[PDB]
């Protein structure tokens, strides 16, 4: 007996309600004078149930007003043009009608494999260049690792590609600087459970061929650590660690992927990755030396020091250069081992090696 | 006189209600036209009581709508196939029906013994690789220690094993780094009372044979401190402490389990544990020396220093090496005492001892 409302005015009535195996089917009727205003496309939204949602800015009361809730009824969102097809789905609220989401579980737009990540169970937003795109729907266990299902909107499904790489950031992150600090402009689920970001690269298609699924990286940089991989053989690990930058003339060109002992225990193997742009810099005769920490100087007649709030002090930078020479040794192949120098070459600031590109 | 609802439409009625010793028993009737839609499996959920739950994302109003609460009734969750057995339990809300949890106290999936831990009284989640699995139901006193009861879901009861080891983390933990800091993506009870994590190891079955119950470790590392246990005899404790790392060529291979005086008071016994992977590194002729703190150098003609934001500065690392020699002294047995060297061996960077594995 419920009414049937368009634009706040009743234009029809629910005739009857029949229970089937799959669920309820209603039959409704529209008056002829309002028949021409539905026009083949429309959406039907439940108005018989109140639904108060609370947001930080989202104060909203959907489904009904109190005067209209006692009457109940079905709201019509009219469309422009259509055909008057035989059946129409009924959407439980306005938002699902807008999303065209008749079901409850959104489809898995993409699946990710990640072993151990303190991420959302379901609900954190996906960000493309920190622009809100989709959401996480499910995390499920598997023998290999986690299995994380992401649904994003069809409008943005062009944004994901073969070169899309995904990194997770968990919880509330605040960024500190020398002058002042900021808090991330976090939405709800970002503040609660932590979002997942992704971006497209150039050679990341090579990152997709490895592994049957895209791997959710633990950090933004670990997602970006692509390019030439080399090994340096240091007699001790010292102050290095994972994510420690690699510096050419004071500019970061790569990171330390990881480090461990060799198959023999005399040396320590340090896996590094240089980005593709600077991949041509590394040559077979290149020299690598540790640049960790503040290396001041002293003289008997006068002492001169240096301080530069080094990131190398925070994370011990490995520096490298190339001795000059007309016949250039070619680019280092993948996995080319090297040897760490305990000290700088004295003329590394004086070396001139006009590398191409 | 209450109705009986399937899919939002009444398909039956409560005939009567009889009080027994154990509790109430209802008799209900279903119309023949809807008889074929129950199909032997179903669940019956109370709809006569409203239940508003509040969550950070969990805004939900379970049990009834206002129009349906005056009518009351019992909701049916239909199943696929069955037998129409004689009796069916009645679940107090939708969630317990989904959990198939007719009772109120979940069964103790596992019990843990821990002396003093600032953990949840009841309700914090259990994490496998920080994936939500179960919950803590009870902490109870005992003459030995606490006794902590954990219930996890039957779907994940394959995950626990003889090699499962458990460590507690309490309250809200935030992780700081040199570049920026993050907050743990904590759920409610993690933020309030602190979760319990667990993981499976290789030799942790040996960790289960010791002790009649699994012991809840106070930290993640204290749970992982398994392997070779040795003693070093230092003349003073100095800067060491529990959890202080043990460093081979700058790589952490073990920790300091604990330290105390000997049965005589001249020396200090420091219990250490080296992990199994590096267990072959320790030989009977190995040399241990303190590496705590920043050890700079100075010369009369020129002074050279070193800084590396040492974890050794934060927690004084004990370093060890092995002098070279063709007849290798075998692996150190359990409890083999050693002697701390006040200074480095000068050629420890030059020693070559190609240990296997």
XYZ file of C-alpha atoms in Angstrom:
714
model
C 0.000 0.000 0.000
C 3.082 2.169 0.012
C 3.225 5.336 -2.080
C 5.740 5.905 -4.837
C 7.449 9.266 -4.884
C 9.074 11.296 -7.634
C 10.611 14.686 -6.778
C 8.861 14.657 -3.419
C 5.347 14.101 -4.808
C 3.494 10.804 -5.138
C 3.075 9.673 -8.740
C 2.176 6.057 -8.211
C 1.677 3.206 -5.827
C 3.051 -0.196 -4.952
C 0.465 -2.675 -6.163
C 1.724 -5.831 -4.502
C 4.670 -7.779 -3.151
C 5.492 -11.406 -3.936
C 8.134 -13.545 -2.278
C 10.250 -15.681 -4.591
C 13.180 -18.001 -4.005
C 15.815 -15.388 -4.814
C 13.986 -12.647 -2.937
C 11.143 -10.190 -3.122
C 9.556 -8.917 -6.334
C 7.257 -5.908 -6.269
C 4.705 -4.799 -8.819
C 4.051 -1.059 -8.949
C 1.828 1.234 -10.973
C 2.274 4.759 -12.319
C -0.519 7.152 -13.212
C -0.842 8.059 -16.915
C -0.405 11.781 -16.317
C 3.052 11.117 -14.877
C 3.858 8.251 -17.249
C 5.885 10.395 -19.633
C 8.282 11.599 -16.928
C 10.025 8.276 -16.239
C 11.390 7.872 -19.787
C 12.870 4.399 -19.839
C 15.826 5.072 -17.597
C 15.341 5.664 -13.885
C 16.410 4.241 -10.570
C 14.256 3.079 -7.699
C 15.437 3.752 -4.166
C 13.992 2.505 -0.913
C 12.496 5.214 1.265
C 10.847 3.081 3.958
C 13.951 2.835 6.163
C 15.741 5.673 7.920
C 19.532 5.733 7.735
C 21.527 8.345 9.645
C 25.172 8.471 8.645
C 27.780 10.450 10.536
C 30.905 11.909 8.984
C 33.603 14.356 9.963
C 32.025 16.635 7.390
C 29.415 14.067 6.343
C 26.394 14.805 8.516
C 23.581 13.192 6.562
C 20.174 11.583 7.068
C 19.331 9.380 4.084
C 16.320 7.314 3.122
C 13.438 9.295 4.545
C 12.189 12.271 6.434
C 10.086 11.602 9.518
C 6.849 12.760 7.868
C 7.654 10.562 4.884
C 8.944 7.576 6.856
C 5.535 6.691 8.295
C 4.200 6.646 4.747
C 7.241 4.799 3.484
C 7.417 4.382 -0.255
C 9.890 4.220 -3.103
C 11.731 7.234 -4.454
C 12.301 7.533 -8.189
C 15.437 9.063 -9.657
C 14.261 9.874 -13.184
C 16.456 9.495 -16.217
C 16.622 11.157 -19.596
C 15.776 8.546 -22.214
C 15.209 4.846 -22.496
C 12.958 2.002 -23.440
C 10.881 1.019 -20.371
C 12.495 -2.360 -19.915
C 10.550 -5.050 -18.104
C 12.402 -5.176 -14.785
C 14.317 -2.730 -12.667
C 16.539 -3.404 -9.658
C 15.688 -1.832 -6.326
C 18.554 -0.066 -4.555
C 18.705 -0.066 -0.768
C 19.849 3.558 -0.495
C 20.652 6.597 -2.582
C 24.412 6.041 -2.648
C 24.225 2.538 -4.098
C 21.794 3.812 -6.710
C 24.337 6.459 -7.686
C 27.115 3.865 -7.729
C 24.912 1.559 -9.849
C 25.863 -1.062 -7.261
C 22.858 -3.333 -6.838
C 24.932 -6.013 -5.105
C 26.736 -5.715 -1.772
C 30.264 -6.932 -2.507
C 32.079 -4.871 -5.159
C 33.962 -6.816 -7.787
C 37.678 -7.406 -7.310
C 39.200 -4.932 -9.745
C 42.701 -6.221 -8.954
C 44.379 -8.700 -6.618
C 47.695 -8.260 -4.839
C 49.999 -10.661 -3.045
C 51.878 -9.437 0.013
C 53.378 -11.540 2.778
C 53.216 -9.411 5.931
C 51.648 -5.974 5.829
C 49.815 -4.080 8.598
C 47.137 -2.849 6.248
C 43.392 -2.374 6.172
C 41.209 -5.437 6.476
C 38.590 -3.724 4.280
C 37.855 -0.121 3.504
C 40.912 2.071 3.043
C 40.998 4.206 -0.050
C 43.308 3.679 -3.014
C 45.266 6.715 -4.190
C 46.694 7.596 -7.590
C 49.134 10.453 -6.966
C 47.151 10.888 -3.732
C 43.855 11.189 -5.606
C 41.066 8.993 -4.296
C 40.138 6.216 -6.692
C 39.008 2.965 -5.102
C 38.911 0.883 -1.969
C 40.119 -2.324 -0.378
C 37.380 -4.913 -0.020
C 39.012 -8.096 1.256
C 42.161 -9.519 2.758
C 42.252 -13.291 2.772
C 44.880 -15.817 3.839
C 46.694 -18.046 1.410
C 49.516 -20.553 1.685
C 51.971 -18.256 -0.080
C 50.988 -14.951 1.509
C 48.100 -12.579 1.977
C 45.717 -12.013 -0.900
C 44.339 -8.484 -1.066
C 41.399 -7.531 -3.265
C 40.968 -3.967 -4.476
C 37.906 -2.495 -6.118
C 38.249 0.817 -7.913
C 35.691 2.779 -9.842
C 35.125 2.043 -13.552
C 35.843 5.686 -14.370
C 39.433 5.184 -13.196
C 40.049 1.644 -14.426
C 41.990 3.204 -17.285
C 44.476 4.537 -14.717
C 45.706 1.094 -13.691
C 48.011 -0.500 -16.236
C 50.678 -3.142 -16.714
C 53.156 -0.644 -15.244
C 51.083 -0.023 -12.118
C 53.010 -0.667 -8.903
C 51.457 -0.622 -5.457
C 52.885 0.374 -2.099
C 51.229 0.384 1.299
C 51.364 3.063 3.972
C 49.815 2.129 7.307
C 48.339 4.172 10.128
C 48.706 7.901 10.670
C 51.955 9.302 9.261
C 53.248 12.776 10.129
C 56.126 14.415 8.285
C 58.721 16.374 10.253
C 61.109 18.975 8.842
C 63.651 21.435 10.192
C 61.252 24.369 9.971
C 57.973 22.669 10.943
C 55.920 19.508 10.721
C 52.643 18.517 9.107
C 50.043 15.812 9.545
C 48.766 13.871 6.555
C 45.349 15.104 5.450
C 43.949 11.698 6.229
C 40.403 10.559 5.548
C 38.725 8.160 7.980
C 40.044 4.768 6.885
C 43.462 6.244 6.165
C 43.587 7.446 9.763
C 42.253 4.111 11.036
C 43.785 1.419 8.863
C 45.961 3.110 6.257
C 45.563 3.618 2.526
C 47.311 1.981 -0.428
C 48.872 4.044 -3.178
C 49.914 3.079 -6.669
C 51.536 4.647 -9.687
C 52.643 3.787 -13.205
C 56.304 3.563 -14.220
C 58.215 2.835 -17.422
C 59.943 -0.510 -16.878
C 57.381 -1.736 -14.340
C 55.922 -4.051 -16.987
C 59.103 -6.027 -16.333
C 57.987 -5.821 -12.701
C 54.693 -7.485 -13.652
C 56.204 -10.407 -15.578
C 57.993 -11.444 -12.402
C 55.384 -12.884 -10.054
C 51.908 -14.036 -11.058
C 50.332 -11.104 -9.204
C 51.475 -7.602 -8.422
C 53.218 -7.431 -5.064
C 52.172 -4.760 -2.593
C 55.393 -3.085 -1.537
C 55.973 -2.110 2.066
C 57.104 1.408 1.171
C 57.001 3.963 -1.607
C 60.737 3.638 -2.235
C 60.713 -0.163 -2.152
C 58.109 0.037 -4.892
C 60.364 2.366 -6.866
C 63.598 0.378 -6.410
C 63.883 -0.709 -10.041
C 66.863 -0.701 -12.351
C 70.386 -2.047 -12.325
C 71.186 -4.417 -9.469
C 74.804 -4.770 -8.356
C 76.716 -6.150 -5.377
C 79.469 -4.517 -3.348
C 81.621 -6.715 -1.130
C 82.434 -4.970 2.045
C 84.530 -6.525 4.830
C 81.878 -5.413 7.335
C 78.333 -4.113 7.188
C 79.053 -1.102 9.366
C 76.392 1.576 9.387
C 74.519 0.545 6.246
C 70.941 -0.661 6.117
C 68.027 -1.262 3.804
C 66.981 1.897 1.994
C 70.337 3.575 2.451
C 70.926 5.911 -0.512
C 73.686 5.659 -3.099
C 75.270 8.981 -3.960
C 76.962 10.187 -7.126
C 78.428 13.671 -6.614
C 76.041 14.106 -3.704
C 72.969 13.149 -5.746
C 70.926 10.068 -4.915
C 70.921 7.647 -7.833
C 69.965 4.448 -6.078
C 69.407 2.649 -2.825
C 70.593 -0.376 -0.890
C 68.106 -3.145 -1.573
C 69.457 -5.473 1.109
C 72.588 -6.973 2.549
C 73.861 -10.300 3.858
C 76.964 -12.407 4.212
C 78.411 -14.253 1.263
C 78.333 -18.006 0.871
C 81.711 -17.684 2.543
C 81.774 -15.640 5.721
C 84.776 -13.410 4.993
C 82.836 -10.654 3.252
C 79.436 -8.987 3.324
C 77.409 -8.807 0.130
C 75.317 -5.656 -0.227
C 72.655 -5.660 -2.898
C 72.125 -2.228 -4.398
C 69.857 -0.893 -7.108
C 70.607 2.101 -9.274
C 67.688 3.744 -11.041
C 67.408 3.443 -14.802
C 68.091 7.125 -15.529
C 71.522 6.867 -13.924
C 72.104 3.287 -15.075
C 74.631 4.466 -17.659
C 76.747 6.050 -14.922
C 78.024 2.755 -13.521
C 80.997 1.432 -15.476
C 83.101 -1.679 -15.009
C 86.005 0.317 -13.559
C 83.861 2.411 -11.213
C 85.033 2.797 -7.622
C 82.743 2.557 -4.596
C 83.644 3.969 -1.208
C 81.777 4.393 2.040
C 80.689 7.942 2.824
C 78.831 7.316 6.093
C 78.948 9.853 8.880
C 80.555 13.228 9.476
C 84.175 13.100 8.320
C 85.868 16.169 9.754
C 89.566 16.964 9.408
C 92.272 18.256 11.704
C 95.662 19.853 11.306
C 98.344 20.603 13.855
C 98.495 24.259 12.791
C 94.761 24.564 12.127
C 91.707 22.339 12.068
C 88.931 22.589 9.493
C 85.746 20.533 9.795
C 82.531 19.993 7.869
C 78.895 19.491 8.870
C 75.923 19.308 6.550
C 73.020 17.664 8.456
C 73.862 14.591 6.390
C 71.270 12.073 5.401
C 74.467 10.029 5.200
C 74.723 10.534 8.939
C 71.159 9.287 9.256
C 71.677 6.523 6.664
C 75.267 5.891 5.609
C 75.656 6.875 1.981
C 77.736 4.766 -0.380
C 79.427 7.002 -2.918
C 80.865 5.998 -6.254
C 82.732 7.562 -9.130
C 84.619 6.522 -12.238
C 88.315 7.109 -12.919
C 88.910 8.981 -16.176
C 90.009 7.270 -19.355
C 89.412 7.560 -23.094
C 88.437 3.867 -23.628
C 85.373 3.680 -21.419
C 84.757 0.338 -19.806
C 81.153 -0.547 -20.672
C 78.107 -0.520 -18.429
C 78.164 -2.937 -15.523
C 76.149 -6.071 -16.129
C 73.528 -7.262 -13.674
C 75.006 -8.749 -10.534
C 78.509 -7.426 -11.152
C 80.310 -7.605 -7.835
C 82.486 -4.727 -6.681
C 84.734 -3.871 -3.755
C 84.107 -1.152 -1.214
C 86.888 1.360 -0.669
C 87.467 2.369 2.932
C 88.367 5.914 1.868
C 87.654 8.361 -0.905
C 89.804 8.488 -4.000
C 91.608 11.766 -3.563
C 90.975 13.049 -7.087
C 87.337 11.993 -7.418
C 86.305 15.642 -7.404
C 88.912 16.224 -10.112
C 87.965 13.306 -12.361
C 86.266 14.249 -15.597
C 84.304 11.474 -17.301
C 81.837 12.979 -19.786
C 79.367 10.138 -19.827
C 76.611 10.348 -22.459
C 72.942 11.103 -21.760
C 1.684 -14.181 18.361
C 4.846 -12.888 16.772
C 5.341 -13.083 13.011
C 8.138 -15.017 11.371
C 9.997 -13.258 8.601
C 11.975 -14.502 5.626
C 13.576 -11.961 3.268
C 11.508 -9.189 4.811
C 8.125 -10.882 4.283
C 6.161 -12.942 6.795
C 6.045 -16.642 5.937
C 4.931 -18.064 9.239
C 4.070 -17.479 12.841
C 5.192 -18.357 16.334
C 2.624 -20.809 17.636
C 3.566 -20.893 21.298
C 6.273 -20.532 23.914
C 6.998 -22.988 26.723
C 9.364 -22.478 29.631
C 11.594 -25.417 30.508
C 14.342 -25.903 33.062
C 17.163 -25.121 30.640
C 15.287 -22.233 29.049
C 12.593 -21.328 26.585
C 11.389 -23.549 23.744
C 9.236 -22.116 20.977
C 7.000 -23.908 18.522
C 6.537 -22.174 15.174
C 4.631 -22.896 11.989
C 5.370 -22.251 8.318
C 2.792 -21.983 5.560
C 2.874 -24.735 2.903
C 3.423 -22.317 0.032
C 6.689 -21.199 1.629
C 7.589 -24.639 2.991
C 9.936 -25.486 0.135
C 12.110 -22.402 0.660
C 13.622 -23.379 4.024
C 15.307 -26.555 2.725
C 16.621 -28.261 5.825
C 19.373 -25.810 6.627
C 18.555 -22.345 7.924
C 19.227 -20.142 10.900
C 16.751 -18.386 13.141
C 17.611 -14.933 14.428
C 15.799 -12.847 16.995
C 14.225 -9.696 15.611
C 12.223 -8.554 18.646
C 15.082 -6.590 20.235
C 16.821 -3.535 18.824
C 20.612 -3.432 19.019
C 22.529 -0.347 17.898
C 26.256 -0.923 17.616
C 28.755 1.864 17.085
C 32.082 1.455 15.331
C 34.782 3.697 13.952
C 33.570 2.534 10.563
C 30.959 0.177 12.022
C 27.778 2.237 12.199
C 25.098 -0.432 12.365
C 21.586 -1.016 13.701
C 20.938 -4.750 14.037
C 17.941 -6.804 15.068
C 15.030 -4.756 13.813
C 13.743 -1.704 12.078
C 11.319 0.486 14.004
C 8.316 -0.548 11.895
C 9.305 -4.177 12.374
C 10.256 -3.907 16.046
C 6.687 -3.323 17.222
C 5.704 -6.482 15.372
C 8.764 -8.316 16.608
C 9.285 -11.736 15.118
C 12.016 -14.120 14.058
C 14.117 -13.650 10.950
C 15.063 -16.681 8.881
C 18.395 -16.983 7.111
C 17.608 -19.682 4.547
C 20.069 -22.353 3.558
C 20.642 -24.414 0.455
C 19.935 -28.037 1.326
C 19.229 -30.181 4.324
C 16.950 -32.566 6.105
C 14.540 -30.546 8.296
C 15.942 -31.759 11.581
C 13.708 -31.675 14.630
C 15.218 -28.767 16.559
C 17.028 -25.592 15.677
C 18.912 -23.204 17.958
C 17.814 -19.593 18.187
C 20.570 -17.001 17.804
C 20.351 -13.732 19.705
C 21.629 -11.598 16.819
C 22.773 -11.814 13.230
C 26.491 -11.921 14.012
C 26.284 -14.949 16.293
C 24.183 -16.704 13.675
C 26.928 -16.054 11.134
C 29.575 -17.229 13.597
C 27.485 -20.353 14.331
C 28.055 -19.388 17.965
C 24.922 -20.353 19.867
C 26.689 -20.086 23.227
C 28.171 -16.953 24.792
C 31.694 -17.985 25.791
C 33.853 -19.119 22.853
C 35.891 -22.249 23.389
C 39.511 -21.908 24.466
C 41.377 -22.664 21.256
C 44.720 -22.420 23.074
C 46.045 -21.555 26.525
C 49.188 -19.598 27.330
C 51.192 -19.123 30.500
C 52.818 -15.757 31.138
C 53.941 -14.344 34.463
C 53.569 -10.565 34.185
C 52.182 -9.016 31.031
C 50.175 -5.787 30.615
C 47.801 -7.354 28.143
C 44.108 -7.408 27.362
C 41.765 -8.826 29.958
C 39.455 -10.013 27.153
C 38.968 -8.909 23.593
C 42.154 -8.013 21.746
C 42.640 -9.595 18.372
C 45.203 -12.272 17.555
C 47.406 -11.634 14.525
C 49.199 -14.031 12.198
C 51.696 -11.903 10.263
C 49.428 -9.020 11.324
C 46.350 -10.683 9.835
C 43.346 -10.833 12.133
C 42.529 -14.354 13.249
C 41.098 -14.693 16.745
C 40.600 -13.051 20.093
C 41.496 -13.225 23.760
C 38.618 -14.390 25.926
C 39.968 -14.796 29.451
C 42.886 -14.029 31.709
C 42.800 -15.914 34.976
C 45.190 -16.108 37.921
C 47.127 -19.213 38.793
C 49.790 -20.069 41.344
C 52.509 -20.280 38.703
C 51.530 -17.304 36.557
C 48.724 -15.882 34.488
C 46.662 -18.221 32.353
C 45.472 -16.666 29.104
C 42.809 -18.261 26.923
C 42.665 -17.532 23.209
C 39.850 -18.390 20.847
C 40.520 -18.244 17.128
C 38.257 -19.074 14.245
C 38.022 -22.674 12.979
C 38.986 -21.498 9.495
C 42.416 -20.519 10.834
C 42.984 -23.327 13.327
C 45.266 -24.885 10.731
C 47.548 -21.848 11.083
C 48.510 -22.626 14.673
C 50.976 -25.480 14.983
C 53.553 -27.061 17.262
C 55.989 -24.384 16.063
C 53.650 -21.505 16.901
C 55.222 -18.943 19.231
C 53.343 -16.048 20.771
C 54.480 -12.565 21.715
C 52.502 -9.736 23.253
C 52.499 -6.073 22.287
C 50.591 -3.766 24.617
C 48.942 -0.397 24.132
C 49.428 1.973 21.220
C 52.860 1.664 19.599
C 54.222 4.244 17.151
C 57.340 3.658 15.077
C 59.818 6.501 14.600
C 62.451 6.743 11.867
C 64.959 9.303 10.647
C 62.732 10.445 7.792
C 59.299 10.224 9.449
C 57.134 8.313 11.882
C 53.987 6.223 11.637
C 51.234 5.077 13.956
C 50.167 1.444 14.025
C 46.934 0.906 12.106
C 45.309 -0.227 15.307
C 41.798 -1.605 15.631
C 39.780 -0.824 18.763
C 41.041 -3.397 21.260
C 44.578 -3.064 19.933
C 44.405 0.650 20.702
C 42.800 -0.018 24.092
C 44.411 -3.153 25.467
C 46.908 -4.413 22.904
C 46.901 -7.394 20.570
C 48.851 -10.658 20.665
C 50.768 -11.890 17.654
C 52.100 -15.320 16.839
C 54.080 -17.029 14.126
C 55.485 -20.425 13.213
C 59.213 -21.188 13.227
C 61.392 -24.196 12.429
C 62.901 -25.309 15.738
C 60.049 -23.899 17.832
C 58.749 -27.435 18.378
C 61.757 -27.674 20.692
C 60.302 -24.511 22.225
C 57.042 -26.371 22.892
C 58.597 -29.411 24.586
C 60.016 -27.088 27.224
C 57.128 -25.953 29.403
C 53.716 -27.610 29.585
C 52.105 -24.631 27.841
C 53.326 -22.122 25.313
C 54.739 -19.036 26.996
C 53.582 -15.625 25.832
C 56.759 -13.673 25.202
C 57.029 -10.042 26.209
C 58.404 -8.970 22.831
C 58.692 -10.081 19.234
C 62.451 -10.556 19.534
C 62.242 -12.404 22.850
C 59.931 -14.822 21.079
C 62.474 -15.210 18.289
C 65.553 -15.622 20.519
C 66.140 -19.281 19.672
C 69.329 -21.084 18.778
C 72.767 -21.525 20.267
C 73.173 -20.211 23.806
C 76.644 -19.210 24.988
C 78.190 -17.223 27.833
C 80.804 -14.484 27.684
C 82.624 -13.550 30.877
C 83.203 -9.886 31.028
C 84.942 -8.143 33.945
C 82.112 -5.587 33.997
C 78.663 -5.275 32.488
C 79.306 -1.836 31.041
C 76.783 -0.630 28.505
C 75.179 -3.969 27.661
C 71.579 -4.908 28.317
C 68.881 -7.381 27.421
C 68.164 -7.411 23.702
C 71.535 -5.965 22.783
C 72.518 -7.304 19.344
C 75.503 -9.489 18.517
C 77.316 -8.459 15.365
C 79.362 -10.474 12.898
C 80.933 -8.186 10.280
C 78.296 -5.605 11.143
C 75.397 -8.034 10.675
C 73.141 -8.999 13.564
C 73.309 -12.733 14.196
C 72.039 -12.893 17.744
C 71.082 -11.033 20.868
C 71.931 -10.820 24.546
C 69.398 -12.957 26.370
C 70.371 -11.740 29.836
C 73.273 -11.064 32.126
C 74.256 -11.536 35.762
C 77.208 -12.105 38.031
C 78.850 -15.488 38.282
C 78.635 -17.723 41.317
C 81.845 -15.913 42.174
C 81.692 -12.142 42.002
C 84.850 -11.461 39.984
C 83.221 -11.689 36.567
C 79.911 -10.994 34.861
C 78.217 -13.778 32.933
C 76.318 -12.624 29.852
C 73.932 -15.090 28.285
C 73.712 -14.683 24.530
C 71.783 -16.481 21.826
C 72.880 -16.790 18.231
C 70.227 -17.663 15.673
C 70.303 -21.071 14.032
C 71.223 -19.798 10.556
C 74.466 -18.335 11.885
C 74.990 -21.098 14.449
C 77.811 -22.574 12.370
C 79.720 -19.288 12.558
C 80.699 -19.665 16.212
C 83.785 -21.835 16.644
C 85.686 -22.874 19.747
C 88.523 -20.440 19.007
C 86.261 -17.494 18.180
C 87.093 -14.135 19.743
C 84.508 -11.790 21.254
C 85.140 -8.105 21.807
C 82.986 -5.208 22.895
C 81.991 -2.809 20.128
C 79.795 -0.422 22.132
C 79.757 3.265 21.344
C 81.454 5.579 18.875
C 85.160 4.739 18.732
C 86.844 7.627 16.953
C 90.591 7.955 16.424
C 93.118 10.751 16.698
C 96.601 11.420 15.425
C 99.052 14.158 16.288
C 99.476 15.096 12.620
C 95.843 14.449 11.692
C 92.710 13.090 13.307
C 90.214 10.827 11.561
C 86.922 9.856 13.200
C 83.889 7.728 12.418
C 80.154 8.115 13.024
C 77.417 5.843 11.760
C 74.268 6.477 13.868
C 75.164 3.200 15.563
C 72.568 0.919 17.010
C 75.670 -0.089 18.958
C 75.584 3.401 20.408
C 71.951 2.828 21.324
C 72.590 -0.768 22.461
C 76.233 -1.776 22.800
C 77.022 -4.381 20.178
C 79.222 -7.351 21.005
C 81.255 -8.305 17.962
C 82.964 -11.598 17.293
C 85.174 -13.171 14.677
C 87.306 -16.257 14.193
C 91.073 -16.321 13.678
C 92.070 -18.147 10.493
C 93.394 -21.681 10.481
C 93.180 -24.791 8.313
C 92.091 -27.174 11.144
C 88.820 -25.552 12.132
C 87.895 -25.887 15.765
C 84.355 -27.300 15.773
C 81.110 -25.540 16.595
C 80.769 -24.252 20.133
C 78.680 -26.478 22.353
C 75.780 -25.125 24.371
C 76.872 -23.081 27.351
C 80.477 -22.731 26.215
C 81.936 -19.854 28.185
C 84.119 -17.276 26.472
C 86.108 -14.186 27.394
C 85.362 -10.664 26.260
C 88.189 -8.758 24.614
C 88.460 -5.112 25.591
C 89.624 -4.186 22.085
C 89.300 -5.382 18.529
C 91.745 -7.854 17.068
C 93.649 -5.713 14.622
C 93.423 -8.139 11.702
C 89.789 -9.179 12.122
C 88.931 -7.390 8.890
C 91.816 -9.270 7.271
C 90.959 -12.736 8.581
C 89.630 -15.152 6.003
C 87.717 -18.139 7.370
C 85.576 -19.670 4.613
C 82.994 -21.291 6.822
C 80.521 -23.620 5.084
C 76.840 -22.862 4.452
